[PDB]
Design a protein around this nucleic acid. Sequence first.
DNA 1: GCAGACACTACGAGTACATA
DNA 2: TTTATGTACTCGTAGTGTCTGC
Lengths: 320, 340, 331, 258, 330, 260
Amino acid sequence: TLSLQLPWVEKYRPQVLSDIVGNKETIDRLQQIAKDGNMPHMIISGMPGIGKTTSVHCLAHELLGRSYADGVLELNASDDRGIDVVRNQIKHFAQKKLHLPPGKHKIVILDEADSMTAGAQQALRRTMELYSNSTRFAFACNQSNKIIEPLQSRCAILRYSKLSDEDVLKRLLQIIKLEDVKYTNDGLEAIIFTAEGDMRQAINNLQSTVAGHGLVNADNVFKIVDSPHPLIVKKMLLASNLEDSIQILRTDLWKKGYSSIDIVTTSFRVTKNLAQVKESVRLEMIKEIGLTHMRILEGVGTYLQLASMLAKIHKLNNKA
Amino acid sequence: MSLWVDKYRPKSLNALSHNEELTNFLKSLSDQPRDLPHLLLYGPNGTGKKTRCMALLESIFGPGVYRLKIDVRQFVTASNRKLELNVVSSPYHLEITPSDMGNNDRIVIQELLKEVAQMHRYKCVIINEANSLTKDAQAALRRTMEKYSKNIRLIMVCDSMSPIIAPIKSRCLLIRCPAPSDSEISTILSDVVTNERIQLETKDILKRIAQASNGNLRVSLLMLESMALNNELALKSSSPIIKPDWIIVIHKLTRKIVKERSVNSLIECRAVLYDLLAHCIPANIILKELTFSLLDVETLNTTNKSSIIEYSSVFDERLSLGNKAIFHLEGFIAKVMCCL
Amino acid sequence: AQQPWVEKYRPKNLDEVTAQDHAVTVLKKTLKSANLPHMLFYGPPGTGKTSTILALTKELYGPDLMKSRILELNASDERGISIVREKVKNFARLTVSKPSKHDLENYPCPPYKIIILDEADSMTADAQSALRRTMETYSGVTRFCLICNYVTRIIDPLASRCSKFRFKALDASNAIDRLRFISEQENVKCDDGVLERILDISAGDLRRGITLLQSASKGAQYLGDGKNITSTQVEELAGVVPHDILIEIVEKVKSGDFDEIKKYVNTFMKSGWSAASVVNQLHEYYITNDNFDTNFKNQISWLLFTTDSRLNNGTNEHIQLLNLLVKISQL
Amino acid sequence: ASMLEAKFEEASLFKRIIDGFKDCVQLVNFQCKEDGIIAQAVDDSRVLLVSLEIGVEAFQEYRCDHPVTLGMDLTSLSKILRCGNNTDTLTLIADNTPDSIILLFEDTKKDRIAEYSLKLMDIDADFLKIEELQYDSTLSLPSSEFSKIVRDLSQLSDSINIMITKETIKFVADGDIGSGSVIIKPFVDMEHPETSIKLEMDQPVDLTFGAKYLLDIIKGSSLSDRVGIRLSSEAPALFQFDLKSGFLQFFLAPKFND
Amino acid sequence: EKRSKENLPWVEKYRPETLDEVYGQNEVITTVRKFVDEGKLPHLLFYGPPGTGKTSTIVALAREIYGKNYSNMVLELNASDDRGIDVVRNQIKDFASTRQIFSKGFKLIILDEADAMTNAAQNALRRVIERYTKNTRFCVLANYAHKLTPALLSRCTRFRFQPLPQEAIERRIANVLVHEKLKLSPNAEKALIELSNGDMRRVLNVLQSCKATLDNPDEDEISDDVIYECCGAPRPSDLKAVLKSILEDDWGTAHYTLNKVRSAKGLALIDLIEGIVKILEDYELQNEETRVHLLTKLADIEYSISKGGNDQIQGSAVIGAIKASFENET
Amino acid sequence: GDRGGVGQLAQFCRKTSTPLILICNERNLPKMRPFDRVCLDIQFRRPDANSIKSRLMTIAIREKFKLDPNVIDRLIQTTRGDIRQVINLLSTISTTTKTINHENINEISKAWEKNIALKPFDIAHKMLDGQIYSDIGSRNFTLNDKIALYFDDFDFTPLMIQENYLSTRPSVLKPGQSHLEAVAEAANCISLGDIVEKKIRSSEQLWSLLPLHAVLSSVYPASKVAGHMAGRINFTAWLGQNSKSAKYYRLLQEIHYHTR
DNA sequence: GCAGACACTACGAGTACATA
DNA sequence: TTTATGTACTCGTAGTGTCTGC
Ligand SMILES: Nc1ncnc2c1ncn2[C@@H]1O[C@H](COP(=O)(O)OP(=O)(O)OP(O)(O)=S)[C@@H](O)[C@H]1O
Ligand SMILES: Nc1ncnc2c1ncn2[C@@H]1O[C@H](COP(=O)(O)OP(=O)(O)OP(O)(O)=S)[C@@H](O)[C@H]1O
Ligand SMILES: Nc1ncnc2c1ncn2[C@@H]1O[C@H](COP(=O)(O)OP(=O)(O)OP(O)(O)=S)[C@@H](O)[C@H]1O
Ligand SMILES: Nc1ncnc2c1ncn2[C@@H]1O[C@H](COP(=O)(O)OP(=O)(O)O)[C@@H](O)[C@H]1O
Ligand SMILES: [Mg+2]
Ligand SMILES: [Mg+2]
Ligand SMILES: [Mg+2]
């Protein structure tokens, strides 16, 4: 069995708060907390892959360089995050006597706290209210709606935002300077367009393209990763001249092996997030796509159901 | 019992003179009990399907089939939800009804037929109101009735057998029970009034009962009893026709919809509909009666009547595919007032 | 015997299965070999899926090994995800039963056991997804045989793995020999066209045809006149609407006058006729007639189809029939 | 005559072997040949392997004409073994192309013969032979002492680090609530040779193991009074429990270190 | 299994045991081979329609990476097996944590049909993927990508298994006939391609059933008649005749022709309707409204057919829908 | 819930020899029902801006960070009177920039909006507003925002829309469309969404249709009857009439068992 | 040695959520 | 009093096995 090279996702994982590129105000605030020391309870939320847990880990490393292995607790959904284990472990950690530097506090990191049970969060509320001058919590969830209201009340909400293409380009050029590779600007633009703000997706696509071909060119990138289905579905829905939408479907979704359920769900999401057309036409289109979704889920999954959904959408578009 | 509908009931096929061809067919079935297929009697409600079933059972098994014993049984469902349904058992046969909660009747019908299937030679099973079974329960009943045939036989009673699934209708011998004619209702009511003591002078009142019942023997007998006790056992040729309060309020709602078309009238109709649904009347019959009362108004034009019946069909389909039973009626009334 | 003619005349071997020549031939040629694949029997009710699978079971093993090498699961027992995950997997993992010496002499017992799953369309999606890899993995020792009336309820991976054997509907051309054999064996006298009418009334439902024939024979025995069955008797027993009432319905429809149609529909619903047969006869009278142009038939086909689709989902027959007759009247 | 005829003296024996790896393994198979009833199975998590061999010496009378494979569910087998007394004598009976075995519980003290049948199973796991023969450290310590050490160190943490030095055996179990360090040195007890501990150190060994699987290992300490651990880097640990005729050797995969 | 091969269905008697034998998928197979030869193997995600060769590809890949003992060197967790978050927290955790027991190489975890997992299980699994990715690789097979958490898609590299083209199915058919000593006709081969619909399992099933149909497996060939009789599929000539009668002739003759075609070989209405839809796609239609009417009415027709009902009324509805849609000046 | 300690606390309230004080968030839980009147009903409200203003002036004096007297109203109204998050907000802002004015107040507000899950009355009140369905309102309050608003209380929102989808004076009427026509259009989609809800809560349990149920039950029916209201939001009356209907059913099967 | 006293895994029943 | 399977969590429960000491 051959050995495996470390993936570029964590082979170039940042270790300093200056390495991560993104929301400049957020990173400056994190650096200020790093220099000062008095870290408040924070709830970091945002889209996947935009550098949430890496910032928390870098901040904890900078704050507890010498006592990271002793005064930092890391829990996630992979651990038994239930009321008994949360109670016992968090209360044992929050009362443990560890002589940190005067500005440094214990940090309890809870990755992906969105999937955490309500009673465990209720216990965490009381634990945070008791032990706050010795330990400081730190959540990192994709959506902050799952976390109960009192936990957000006693924390400091800090939301991330999707990275602009400039920051993804800067990081990609930094990694390309770190490891030698031949690239074309068209290939990098294609990778950035495919990533859609997801830095981890960009790194995975770049690594896959380099391993598959060795040259980061537009054709190689489009061979490794296909065009995203939301874009082709949006092109299908927005286009008039029903025959054109029918052939777009039959060419780019049916013969490319996309399941009918996936096409219908993607159409629902696209027409929900669509902004070019007015509200009433979006509502009708959602109604028709939902009727087709009901038909598909009942079991009648064929090309003709999708064609009929497109036909009803186009009859709506031409205003009968 | 004080009611005249129940204790004036035939007990054998000989006493049944309502339909000669149906009685002859039942006698043909009862001649050889050894080879008896599964029955499914369908037709309009209240014509006496259960009377035919019990008469056939007595003609096959013998007497004592009317010695019904009320036996109670216990059932286990999901979580702690416990349902208690009493089975109306009897010698030589058994009766079961979907009186339990609609969503969970599959387990009950399943373990009753499995238990009775273990122990002339066979034991008949009568399922009253079979059109109310959920489609999964009928699917379970299919293989249960197909596997065991030497031990169990099903006489399945239902009106408007459309909700019955196709395989059940395939393995069930279908028997049609037509509604009583006006002459038959008049003859039965004449027999009842002759056996009892009511000061009756004109046959016109009996025919008016027959017309007002719409081929419903049970409703006709209830009407006769009601206005017989009201009229001090002396029927008058100009006696007003008494109708159930549900009919009266449905007609009042119909007149309210016809005379005014306003949103305040719509919220009043919502209140009335909620009251009627709380009064335990199935939404299908409510929609049917409301539609047939709307179509009887002479003020409405033919195009409005066609639109009303089309929307009535659409919302009847929605009611058959719904679980709230009030949203569909409210939508139907809104569409009707928009049309009017 | 003491059984209805449906159970009494159920096929025993695969030779008695009338029509369905493709599936029966494939199974009979598979009997000599041991290459039985995962089967997916489907078709209209009464076509003979259960009879075929039981005959194949009797032919492969014999009445001794059926109880030991066959597992059947109907809707009579629960078929959720847990039972499929535990009982079906446990049965599949088990080694095949030990044949007796007599069975090895007489029957060609294959080195596998058949897991019949009647009404597989009633399973949930999760149960079928759990069944997929169990079907694909332990297939060397067991064979699955799904039976369902609707393929669409089955998810597409199971449709991919299971070999599909569509069971054709039996009509007056395919199943006339079976009804003739039943009539000759049970000594039932009938006219030349009685059996054709019986098979025409049913729609691929030979079981219903057998029940109708048995009921007609019982009526003839009760009469005791020794007279051959006529088409009118079977027509009346089957629930078939007489043609005079259909002609009256058409006359009312052609004349308009919505109130008259409503009154006649109320009387018709009093008569107790099933709406499905009425719609079927209206279709057979209107489409085959030559007194109507192309546009009338084009509209009335859609009207009848919509009424049939609405009647399939339960609903009140009175309102659906009235609406259908009103829309046809306005044509 | 049944082709497989294996007789057990002191039928509590086979129950002890079955209970040795009932908890860790759920599905086994028994390649019964003329040499003896061997077995080998891998857990669902593919971490711990259980090899087994029972020689002809442990059987009163053993006769196996052809190689037999008996894929089994260990839960049902252990339940069947629990359906008897240690006084009774157990017998495994299988015919040609077996569908199930026959287990007999006979005793001449009182005629109460009980015949149980357990359904077989098609595991279809061909596995492979052991291809590990060279080990750095070969140590043998009493089973009771090792089981006790594992038991009181599994409560502190989930990882038990076994370190081998020059005549020094160290168990480190650092965890959330504290730490642990059990240091045991070789000594030869002349009075009780069974309580002696031996060490044979070639190359230094530093391996960590999971707590739950090590508890599953020590659950077999009732089978034999002494266990011989044979550690080596880039090699699974070999915990061998000797029998009167064969052995019950386990293979445990050390956790990764990064 | 039992009694070796030759007692297995042709679906699994012909299973790819080598990455060279996997036909149809060229870019995917070549990229995977380059991945494993170069030494870098990212978290693979195989997505495609059933029968394309996803699990066959991953099993052949595991066999090539490890050897003949790949069965116990990998952890394949199916929907048939329990895959709750307890399984993710225990079995996947300690299989990724521990070292290999039989070799020195990495650990491969094959989450076959992973779309049928709880969202909590995927959430717990994403941290296992991200933590032990230094020396353990996850492969995810998913028929539907909408049932997967977007984070789980983010961790894994997207690979798409396209429907099988004509050449792959023709080559596999040729190999099947070579091994079975069976003869085929080119027209029958084309019919098999049309019945495939990008699913080789269907082709293998139809070939097995057609060989069973033949009275003599040797000295005989499978023509179109055998294929269409055993599959119960409409012939192109019958579909063309039915469509011509519907589009040109009047109601009585068209109805008689459709009824005769259905009753000649017991043709199902659903397959005839699908054939009509496929033929009507090639038609050039000047009016857009005709397309809308055809698609909507026909879709309602198969929905009602799937719900069941009367076949005569549905056939008349098909005829009426086609005629009324083509009536408005094509 | 049942056997979860609430009945035990009711017993404690019934019989205690020492003062008993309970602290919770809000009373509209069906779990919180057994404390209807057995316990005292003192309630706290959102503190006034003047007391918070004085407290935060003292805080600004103590922590030597600049705090304008006018940005504090916006800081309070963004946080919805939650004083603890207000103090945390000023702390984390003053960590790197201790001076706040009109320049940064909009950024601070958009970055530290409280985002409370809305009360079942509030979902209906916001959804029935005609401003959000206008051209300007659609841009500011997108369709995804309305879907999230439904999913805030997806259990009670479909009903709460329905009991008062006709008690609103319309403001989004199409030219030539009467109010009754809009009400009928809304009722048609309520009926359509009823089927989707039944299919979700059935044997199959197809729970991927919830976003469909959002549009079919709350978004579209409220998109035709939006505008200012005739009265205050009426609570779901379907629950009480459903209870009364269930009791009437139970009585009818009871008298049916007795009459045989 | 026997009977308890303990901690232990295991089973049963009930609440809660289910698309971003 | 509502939904109606499957999943996950949480609890108290009853057996089950092991160590102390009369
Ligand atoms: N601002 C950034 N600068 C540099 N690398 C980044 C940045 N954001 C993300 N990355 C890269 O993304 C990977 C880390 O992503 P994560 O922070 O683990 O994703 P995440 O924010 O935790 O989102 P989820 O919810 O866990 S999927 C590493 O490969 C980083 O190099
Ligand atoms: N091809 C056939 N040849 C002979 N008898 C048949 C045939 N098909 C059906 N039958 C008769 O129909 C009855 C058995 O029907 P089944 O085999 O149960 O049909 P089915 O496929 O099971 O339909 P279901 O399961 O109820 S939907 C017996 O009376 C058989 O004689
Ligand atoms: N590219 C291919 N080359 C050769 N045979 C193939 C190919 N793709 C599929 N097959 C055949 O199809 C059979 C089943 O396909 P599998 O690969 O096992 O399942 P799958 O294609 O992954 O579909 P699902 O989603 O798992 S049901 C295999 O045993 C092969 O005989
Ligand atoms: N031949 C008959 N002569 C007199 N009354 C009859 C006859 N057949 C039926 N009935 C009446 O029908 C009533 C019973 O109807 P029932 O069986 O409840 O109808 P359903 O079966 O539709 O509920 C009895 O009160 C009885 O008087
Ligand atoms: Mg993270
Ligand atoms: Mg069947
Ligand atoms: Mg697969």
